[PDB]
Each structure stands twice: as C-alpha cells, then as structure tokens.
Design a protein around this ligand. Structure first.
Ligand SMILES: NC(=O)c1ccc(Oc2cccc(C(=O)N3CCC(c4ccc(F)cc4)CC3)c2)cc1
Ligand SMILES: NC(=O)c1ccc(Oc2cccc(C(=O)N3CCC(c4ccc(F)cc4)CC3)c2)cc1
Lengths: 182, 185
C-alpha cells in the first residue's frame, strides 16, 4: 500500500481542536500552540483498525486503545504521517507518554531551525501491558508455558502508568499533530 | 483559506517520476533518490494559477513559468506544503525566495540540510519567473522596469539575464511546490 495522506488543519472553533488543546494544556499550558492538524491516511488507518479488531477479539473486556503523546523532530513528521511508527532512535520500540510534558521535552520534540516543536496525539493499542525495561526488543511472554502470547505493550508502572512502549506494526495511528513553541 | 494538502508518492514507473528524477539527475546523479512526492494543495494551486492568469495577461509572449529547484530543511517541508513560499528573512540572503535552474545548487548541504536520518529535501517548483532583470542580493522588492512608471516592477531578479542559473521571487503565490524529492548521499 502507498499510504498517502492529507493534513487537515483544525480551526480553533472546532470541537476536536478544543478537545486536543485541552488534553495538551493539562501539562503544557506554558507553551504557545501554533496549529493542530489531523493526519488522514486511509491505508494506515485501515491497517490500524484491523489490528485493533484482532486485539479487541483477544483481550475481552480490556479497553485496548489509549490516546498518548509522542514528541519527535521536524524531520520525522513526513515519515510518521506516511508510515506511522512502524519499523523504527527512540530511547527498539516506540515510546508514548500519558502526559504531554514528557513529549514536550526538547530531547524528543526537538525545536527545529524556526524554534517549532512537534508532538503527536496518538491512538495507541496499549492492550494488555506489563512492566518493562529499556532493553527489551520484544515484549515479554505472558505465560512461560505459552511463549506464543506476548504482552501488547510494556510500561513503567502497571497501575499508574506514565509511559508505554509499543513494538508491533500498525499499533499506533498518528491522528493529530500539535505544532507549538516556547 | 485553510490550504490543506495531500502528499502523493509517485511510483518509480510513473511518467511523472522519471520526468522529475530525470531533471534532477542532470546534475545530481551521485545522490540516491529515496522518494518523489506530489503536493496537492488545491487552495495554494488556485491562488497560484490566478496569479499566473494575470501575469499571462500582462507579459504578452513571455513564457512566464519555469520549473526550478529549492532546497530546504526538513523543518520547512510541512510549512511549504501548506503555505508555499509566501511571507527571517531566512533564504540565501532577502525578502525573497531563491530558486535554482539546476538542482545541484539546491542540493548543497547549506540549503537542503541533511536531517537527523541523513535525508535531504529539494522541491521541483513551478515558478512565475515572468520578466526578470539582474539582481544584487540586497533587494526587498524587485526594481521597477521603467522610472517613468514605478508602478510596474519586474517579476523576478536573476544572476544573469541571458544565462540565468538562479531566480529570486518576492510576491505571494508566485511559486507552487509541485514535487518534493527526498534523497540521501
Ligand atoms: N518521544 C516521546 O514523546 C517520549 C515519550 C515518553 C518517553 O518516556 C520517557 C520519559 C522520560 C525518560 C525516559 C527514559 O529514557 N527512561 C525512562 C525510565 C526508564 C524506563 C522506564 C520504562 C521503560 F519501559 C523502560 C525504561 C529508563 C528510560 C522515557 C520518552 C519519549
Ligand atoms: N534554497 C535553494 O535551493 C537555493 C537555490 C538557489 C540559490 O542560489 C545561490 C547559490 C549559490 C550562491 C548564492 C548566493 O548567496 N549568491 C549568489 C551570487 C550573488 C547573487 C547573484 C544574483 C542575485 F540576484 C542575487 C545574488 C550573491 C548571492 C545563491 C540558493 C539557495
């Protein structure tokens, strides 16, 4: 699939704009939001909703999907817009933050030559997660009897998570991109 | 206008792909092209074709439009895709935008700066060069053609009026960033 995409800027009067800016300003009010855009990539979306359908049929009552933040540099934006976060420079999976302020750190959302920072608000299939360590390239197996079944994501803390690490293709859809500055 | 846009990657078999890769490799054969994309921004396009329509009505037989190269950094790409080269004055200065006849001027690391992954970005741009004169890297607007009539200024300035290698444009909607070439060394 070609995974072409369109970039739709949301109006400040839009309900989606206020929803996204609201979650971001929970921890990043001190920044100036320049624009919020929706990434419309039908192929990437279909692939994501397909893997969500499979997970929704496997985790029973689990609310598999969460909306999390991902800071990246300006160079990565056209590449995330097209390919999602597939087959990755993270921190060998992809890191997502519960709160925007982790992603607004200059190390991740590096200011570009014009001083602009980029943080995505991502639909992520966190699924069933366990505690991780920054040295896993695949998630651990749920059952030592059945190394078949691995966890979907890993986290820093299973009961009050602040970060999740995803490892599989089409596990995240970069729905909104926030461009801001200090 | 919102000036939203879509980014369509051309297939290596497309007639457009090899047309564009052909113009680029005239002077940049040593690079590897990773992908060629078409920027589809209807609002920016309509605005551009309107300003081409007026210029086509003013310069008689002049072939107003040329296809030129512009290297930029990865940070600028989402901004050019939406806004074109409209309104630091952070070009090769100066209130204008620099376009190269040949891609190798734009492929210089100073303009198409390699990003963290080593990728370089050069647009193949539709530019209304129009009627141009010689420039002197110190212009905020192009000079007026006639001192009798300071109304009508030139459309662009150039390094060489008869063998141009570079153009500077100063007005809004004078350039459309039709194709984006992503490549590496
Ligand atoms: N791009 C982003 O927006 C982004 C979003 C979230 C994000 O999480 C952070 C935030 C701050 C520091 C770190 C950090 O390096 N470690 C955290 C503590 C340790 C650890 C915890 C959990 C693990 F599973 C593995 C290791 C060591 C590594 C990670 C990073 C980037
Ligand atoms: N972004 C780009 O892809 C890009 C495309 C083309 C481009 O042209 C170049 C290439 C090499 C040097 C220069 C340069 O600084 N001057 C050129 C020589 C002099 C000059 C002559 C005529 C003029 F009207 C103005 C100035 C002094 C300044 C500019 C730069 C960037």
């Amino acid at each position: 699939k070609q995974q072409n995409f369109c970039v739709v800027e949301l109006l400040p009067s839009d309900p989606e704009y206020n929803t996204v800016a609201s979650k971001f300003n929970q921890t990043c009010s001190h920044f100036r939001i320049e624009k919020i855009e929706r990434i419309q990539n039908p192929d990437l979306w279909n692939s994501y909703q397909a893997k969500k359908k499979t997970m929704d049929a496997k985790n029973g009552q689990t609310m598999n999907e969460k909306q999390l933040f991902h800071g990246t540099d300006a160079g990565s934006v056209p590449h995330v817009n097209r390919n999602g976060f597939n087959r990755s420079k993270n921190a060998k999976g992809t890191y997502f933050a519960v709160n925007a302020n982790y992603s607004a750190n200059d190390t991740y959302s590096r200011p570009d030559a014009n001083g602009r920072k980029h943080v995505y608000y991502v639909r992520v299939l966190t699924g069933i997660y366990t505690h991780g360590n920054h040295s896993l390239i695949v998630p651990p197996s749920k059952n030592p009897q059945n190394p078949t079944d691995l966890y979907d994501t890993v986290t820093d803390n299973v009961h009050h998570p602040s970060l999740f690490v995803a490892f599989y293709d089409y596990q995240a859809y970069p729905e909104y991109l926030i461009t801001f500055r200090k």
